[PDB]
Design a protein around this ligand. Structure first.
Ligand SMILES: *[C@H](C)[C@H]1/C(=C/c2[nH]c(/C=C3N=C(/C=C4\NC(=O)C(CC)=C4C)C(C)=C\3CCC(=O)O)c(CCC(=O)O)c2C)NC(=O)[C@@H]1C
Ligand SMILES: CCC1=C(C)/C(=C/C2=NC(=C\c3[nH]c(/C=C4\NC(=O)[C@H](C)[C@H]4CC)c(C)c3CCC(=O)O)/C(CCC(=O)O)=C2C)NC1=O
Ligand SMILES: CCC1=C(C)/C(=C/C2=NC(=C\c3[nH]c(/C=C4\NC(=O)[C@H](C)[C@H]4CC)c(C)c3CCC(=O)O)/C(CCC(=O)O)=C2C)NC1=O
Ligand SMILES: CCC1=C(C)/C(=C/C2=NC(=C\c3[nH]c(/C=C4\NC(=O)[C@H](C)[C@H]4CC)c(C)c3CCC(=O)O)/C(CCC(=O)O)=C2C)NC1=O
Ligand SMILES: CCC1=C(C)/C(=C/C2=NC(=C\c3[nH]c(/C=C4\NC(=O)[C@H](C)[C@H]4CC)c(C)c3CCC(=O)O)/C(CCC(=O)O)=C2C)NC1=O
Ligand SMILES: CCC1=C(C)/C(=C/C2=NC(=C\c3[nH]c(/C=C4\NC(=O)[C@H](C)[C@H]4CC)c(C)c3CCC(=O)O)/C(CCC(=O)O)=C2C)NC1=O
Ligand SMILES: CCC1=C(C)/C(=C/C2=NC(=C\c3[nH]c(/C=C4\NC(=O)[C@H](C)[C@H]4CC)c(C)c3CCC(=O)O)/C(CCC(=O)O)=C2C)NC1=O
Ligand SMILES: CCC1=C(C)/C(=C/C2=NC(=C\c3[nH]c(/C=C4\NC(=O)[C@H](C)[C@H]4CC)c(C)c3CCC(=O)O)/C(CCC(=O)O)=C2C)NC1=O
Ligand SMILES: CCC1=C(C)/C(=C/C2=NC(=C\c3[nH]c(/C=C4\NC(=O)[C@H](C)[C@H]4CC)c(C)c3CCC(=O)O)/C(CCC(=O)O)=C2C)NC1=O
Lengths: 161, 160, 65, 160, 160, 161, 160, 160, 161, 160, 65
């Protein structure tokens, strides 16, 4: 829930003492990268429906999971399956604006280990659906900002499966 | 901080955050290099501020200096002098944070039930940080004191 | 921060025609500040709680909520 | 379960009527019952001055409880000493009832497994309890501290 | 019990005990010896009140042991006087608990369905406890007919 | 919830090929014995207040628990050990009339096993009470409808074990 | 099935099946052979009932077949054959069940977010359904035009 | 009055007054003239009480008269004894009532906010009521002073 | 030092009546668990050495307790610390055959709380020594055979906390 | 049972159980069904066994019902047949336990001075259980009276 | 480094006519190595460890005996 800003503040009070110059350089390393990661937030807030549309149209719109059987046959099990995708994309903007991967641990990645297992939901489609989703954002926000969001985006892959 | 104060506000209405917020976060980072200058002024002043203002609240309130008060004794005058070291070291996290979400949860939330259990006057520490506020505006260059002095003014208006 | 509570509680005063299995057994997510009150409300009906491990995690932290 | 009512309830689990192997247990409650309301009036009057002196020497000045550790920030101190009322309140609610079964489940439902998830030091809250046990017994008398000997120790023995 | 009626009301408002409530417990403790010995002569006259109660039942309400009733045959009336013994089993700690509420747990909260589910008329067992009313208080002292007859009014009014 | 009409609808629908001659035969497997199954339900609806007292009279009327000193001795929990027999009867005749154990999974047996431990209640007596209810429900419904109800009560007590 | 939501409407009131409802579940079974043969005709003539009716969509709404569209080309109006076949499939499942719960389980409640993610206006699809209703009843008899079209009017109202 | 709160406890459960509460009414009334002469000693020696309680108020906490506090100066110390006069008038009502609900309706349910919005610490007020406890119980024989002490100690517990 | 046969004798002997007929069924419930616990206890007593070694390898051999500065740095503390763990499960195999945790009550709960804070060993790490134990037995002896082992396992640490 | 004796013969050697002792204790529990059928005939006819085996004490030893004897008196014989009932309780615990150890935890040690203090002859109650041996094996069959006759002759080793 | 304990053990083995009263409520100094055997001797004697005092312990000091 804490960012990279109050990461060093929380480590300052576990150690108790005031933050020193090495802790100052950890905080001001955000400030060299702060004005560029907000530039990613400008163009990712616009076309947020566009990123989750064609990522379905890459490999999930004519598929066996979309044909009888599967888990996107009916429109209601569709209506969560696309609803999870922008929820990953919104919280990826929440992660990449704060520097910390700890925001989406308790808000997204809390129950996703067993709720996808208990409902009979393929994660291996959704892991396939996000690595194509990861590559199209770095083309749209630029490669200077698309790299740093990807390690918060590949943080989702470590908690998913 | 001003990220996480706004991020929980965007999540509560379940949407991508406003462009009204985009001019908030851009101005915070581009003014952060002078914001860290305010924190290092408090490094070498961390004995200078607390030595004067604890005695200044003792002359603003000589209720405490007599036997029968609450700071009275070499472990008891060291109680409030150390707690004034804490509240200085509290809000210097919140200068460079730029808002109140570091100070309010670990400083402000459980206070009134604590100080009545500790027997300390809440009006003493309310005007004690008022003594801490006035010398903080002097050593800084006016306007940067005025943006950092409001977190003192948050701390005054939220005890009582 | 929030908890994942599960608990069992009957009602004493009445016999109900509806089923009430979700009312006699819970597995709820409750936040941190409601839990000071939500735990005490099961005490008035005398229901037992069992597994109260937190799901949001990060215990013992100071800031960041 | 309100110790008149528990030996009523134990009679119905036995099924038979109120026998004089249990009628004198009712007279055991009625003998100490005249002091029992009188012991309640002291501890209700001396309610929150105890928890100033309770933690006060018990662990209040323990450094390891100001630096970094569970009960050290502002919000978690006053949340913790909130329960020190409720530990003390249900200690009275035990001894008004004369019974440990109003105490084994309200304050004591899942609090072993709550406080491990909170990261509470278990024995430190025991060490707060073991000689805040005596300071309420000092005012009410050691003759009245004996019934406070069993019911105040029932929480921490159930917490351990 | 009367202690239960106070310390769940003070538990709800998160308070201690008012001394107006505390003298209800103090007057309960002094009136315990007057209350317990009513149950001692009820337990001595256990096999006395039930005998004429069926004779007060079956001479006024003969439909149960007539062919076409639920208590037909000598096996069924031997359980029926046993079930009226269960209500006298309930009553002799109602003059120990001081008030209704252990009768409210074990006597009255399922009685409108179960006797209906077991085919018996609910008014006849409601008659059987009010025919027991005249032959119980007259079998004891004249002042305590209001005391022991108080909890008979709950047993009448809940079934009827 | 899945009716046996909707289950044989679902088994062609997860394949997505249309309803064949085998798939319409399952409806004719339901509609040929449909008439007695409806007429079984009006016998069990009018008698459900009547039949619930002989199930405990065959099993738990006088026993080692229902005396003073055991469970089913408050008259409050004696209401519960009749109302749960009303619950098991009213949901079996739904499961009779639909022809499934899936409604029995959703409503009566979604969490019923776990709650009977911490309430401190005898399970195995309630196993015998439903098993005593078979011979009284088959005497009035006839022999032919008595055996098709028997597999639905047997899903309960196997599910309660 | 007409069973399973008459179950649900009897479950929420905690009641058995009423005999007024029991004729409706009786008359469905004796008329179950009448609906399976009219669902055989939609199973048999499923290719003709989509192919000319798709041109009734493009005659009345030629915006879809325009370039720059959602469903443009030989391969994307192919997907309209790969989408409208399911609605012609599911109406047959609405007929043999007796009501609209196979419609309600598969293709109703998520279509506001389905076709938004697809980018197709739903009322463009829905007028293809209402034109399909006009050509489905060309195959049906004068009796069966109402009842087989009664499950059509739920689908037209679900899109609009 | 006890007849107030024994009504609203019976009005909370839509019930008549139980005969376990009717003897609490009657034994209050016939002993009610005992409570009159207890309260007549309070108003008969109210100047005696207010003189030798405020002296030890400035002995256990002698810093309230020191400058920098509220009660420094002749007019500002006179508001303390003006507020000390407002307390024992209510305990004169509290003795006569039998319940503490005149003290609840008048003088406790806003004291937790209205004094820290005025500048008087409750821990100094709670000493000032218990300084009266040593002298008001001393001005009466200890049988009648035990229940007389059982009312204002609730106010100290409602301060502490 | 009591056993479930002796427990139902002595608890009836507080009332002093004869054998209760519902309480006789508890011995039949003890008979039903009887012939599986003897197959359970031979699995533990064979593999008693490595199951101490497995339970400490999960959470104790690489943590801050045996990282130096804590009490588990010196070996004579540490070999005694293993020795205080071998007497835990050796007294736990007695608990299945006794059928009551009274064997833990008179022996392992006699003075163990007051001695552990006397030396100041960590109680929660001792809980961490046995919550790691409570899975590695049940993985090796059987799921039903590990079911009645955990009810004596939490009786240790709740008696230790 | 032997499971107690298996553990204390293994905990004294600080080891786990032998496989020969493991087969010993699992052979007891299969025989634990068989002793239950023994005790049901004892607890079924517990009213039968004493009331003429105690007569055989009176036929063989008429000293104790002669005046001068201790058990003479109808209030003394009623306690005497209550006393002979008590060992038959101990036998029925020891059939199902399978050893002498519930008799070796309740009623065996003080019997040389239990009856010295009461003045009853120790050889008389030795012949009461010897009559109670021969009566109770007559209610059993041939093979199963040997296991129940093992603990009949254990008690006369204590008394003689 | 050693311990100090007090305990209570009854003996339900044989009736003892003489004084057994230092035998039942002894407090004792015990050394460090003996105590794990000595508590084990108390435990199968049926004793009750009521208090283990500290003062000759200096606990946590892993060296210096
Ligand atoms: C007799 C005056 C009335 C009557 C009695 C009757 N009762 C039964 C059987 C039962 N009655 C009960 C009711 C209670 N049992 C209790 O323990 C309590 C107090 C908690 C109550 C209120 C129960 C549980 C039974 C079942 C057997 C049992 O006692 O456990 C019968 C026999 C009916 C049968 O079918 O066997 C009779 C005749 N019936 C009357 O007509 C009188 C009004
Ligand atoms: C942000 C907070 C949040 C999270 C984490 C969340 C997860 C979540 N995903 C769910 C379902 C789902 N999730 C998927 C997932 C996918 N589709 C696939 O085929 C792939 C394997 C993958 C992505 C392409 C599907 C198909 C369902 C529907 C399961 C069902 O309803 O049967 C459900 C069940 C309820 C529902 O239908 O929505 C939850 C709670 N919901 C939330 O509100
Ligand atoms: C930032 C949140 C925070 C607070 C509040 C805090 C309080 C705190 N106050 C203490 C003592 C104390 N502090 C005071 C304070 C006062 N008495 C006076 O004379 C003054 C009027 C007033 C303060 C200005 C007193 C009286 C004690 C001793 C406790 C007592 O005996 O009442 C101690 C014990 C000594 C130690 O640290 O080991 C702590 C931890 N620590 C914290 O981390
Ligand atoms: C009525 C029976 C009953 C009680 C008493 C009870 C207490 C209780 N103690 C709590 C926390 C706490 N408890 C403690 C414990 C302590 N603090 C100290 O100074 C001592 C050393 C030690 C014991 C008093 C601490 C430090 C917290 C706050 C930790 C946290 O925020 O999780 C909380 C959670 C508050 C929160 O979420 O922050 C509850 C509900 N619950 C109940 O049902
Ligand atoms: C519709 C599916 C469904 C069922 C059946 C159900 C049962 C159910 N049974 C309950 C209690 C109970 N259940 C029983 C059960 C029995 N009596 C026995 O002795 C046997 C072991 C068994 C045979 C019927 C008893 C005695 C209680 C009362 C226990 C108590 O409240 O302490 C309770 C809690 C109190 C109450 O509401 O009555 C529920 C919710 N809930 C559901 O949602
Ligand atoms: C009945 C429940 C249901 C729905 C709603 C459904 C939709 C659906 N439409 C798809 C494609 C599509 N569906 C359409 C359909 C249309 N656009 C038009 O021009 C027409 C107006 C309209 C239909 C006639 C189009 C154009 C695509 C391709 C989109 C693309 O390639 O970007 C796909 C991926 C292909 C596949 O089926 O594997 C699915 C799952 N599937 C279902 O099972
Ligand atoms: C019965 C209901 C009732 C309450 C609760 C009440 C409180 C009360 N206390 C007051 C003042 C005061 N109260 C105190 C308090 C104290 N003096 C001390 O030295 C001690 C520390 C402490 C009490 C033992 C003082 C010093 C003032 C004067 C404050 C001032 O003038 O600023 C005032 C404002 C002046 C006035 O009395 O008109 C009010 C209203 N008045 C009421 O009628
Ligand atoms: C199961 C373990 C156990 C034993 C052994 C036991 C013995 C026992 N025997 C007693 C009395 C007695 N026992 C006898 C015995 C006899 N009178 C005769 O004439 C015969 C020789 C002989 C046997 C019939 C007498 C006479 C008394 C009453 C004492 C007296 O009035 O002298 C009493 C006192 C009455 C009481 O409070 O119960 C106890 C406790 N209680 C136990 O819990
Ligand atoms: C048969 C019943 C019984 C037991 C088990 C028992 C144990 C026991 N464990 C002890 C110490 C100890 N216990 C530990 C404990 C641990 N080390 C860890 O890694 C974990 C945190 C924990 C796992 C169990 C340590 C390190 C010592 C030695 C500490 C010292 O020397 O005081 C001691 C003090 C003397 C000694 O060192 O042996 C006793 C008497 N006493 C008994 O009567």
């Amino acid at each position: 829930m804490q960012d990279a800003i109050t990461s060093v503040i929380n480590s300052s009070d576990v150690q108790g003492k005031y933050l020193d110059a090495s802790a100052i350089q950890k905080l001001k390393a955000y400030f060299a990268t702060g004005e560029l990661r907000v530039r990613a937030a400008t163009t990712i807030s616009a076309n947020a429906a566009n990123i989750v549309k064609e990522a379905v149209a890459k490999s999930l719109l004519y598929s066996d999971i979309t044909r009888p059987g599967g888990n996107m046959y009916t429109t209601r099990r569709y209506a969560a399956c696309i609803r999870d995708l922008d929820y990953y994309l919104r919280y990826a903007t929440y992660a990449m604006l704060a520097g910390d991967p700890s925001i989406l641990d308790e808000r997204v990645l809390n129950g996703l280990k067993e709720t996808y297992n208990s409902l009979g939901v393929p994660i291996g489609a959704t892991v396939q659906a996000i690595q194509a989703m990861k590559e199209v954002t770095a083309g749209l926000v630029g490669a200077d900002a698309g790299k740093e969001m990807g390690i918060y985006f590949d943080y989702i892959c470590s908690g998913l499966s | 901080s001003i990220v996480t104060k706004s991020i929980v506000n965007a999540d509560a209405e379940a949407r991508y955050l406003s462009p009204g917020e985009l001019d908030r976060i851009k101005s915070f980072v581009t003014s952060g290099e002078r914001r860290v200058r305010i924190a290092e002024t408090m490094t070498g002043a961390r004995e200078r501020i607390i030595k004067e203002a604890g005695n200044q609240l003792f002359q603003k309130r000589p209720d405490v200096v007599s036997p029968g008060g609450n700071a009275y004794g070499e472990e008891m005058t060291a109680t409030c002098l150390r707690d004034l070291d804490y509240y200085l070291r509290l809000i210097t996290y919140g200068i460079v944070a730029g808002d109140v979400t570091p100070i309010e949860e670990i400083g402000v939330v459980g206070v009134r039930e604590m100080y009545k259990s500790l027997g300390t006057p809440i009006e003493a520490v309310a005007e004690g940080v008022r003594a801490m506020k006035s010398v903080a505006t002097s050593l800084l260059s006016g306007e940067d004191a005025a943006e950092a002095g409001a977190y003192f003014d948050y701390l005054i208006g939220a005890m009582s | 921060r929030s908890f994942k509570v599960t608990a069992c509680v009957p009602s004493q005063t009445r016999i109900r025609t509806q089923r009430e299995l979700q009312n006699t057994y819970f597995t709820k997510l409750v936040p941190y500040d409601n839990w000071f009150r939500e735990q005490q409300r099961i005490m008035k009906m005398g229901g037992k709680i069992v597994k109260v491990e937190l799901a949001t995690g990060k215990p013992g932290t100071n800031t960041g909520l």
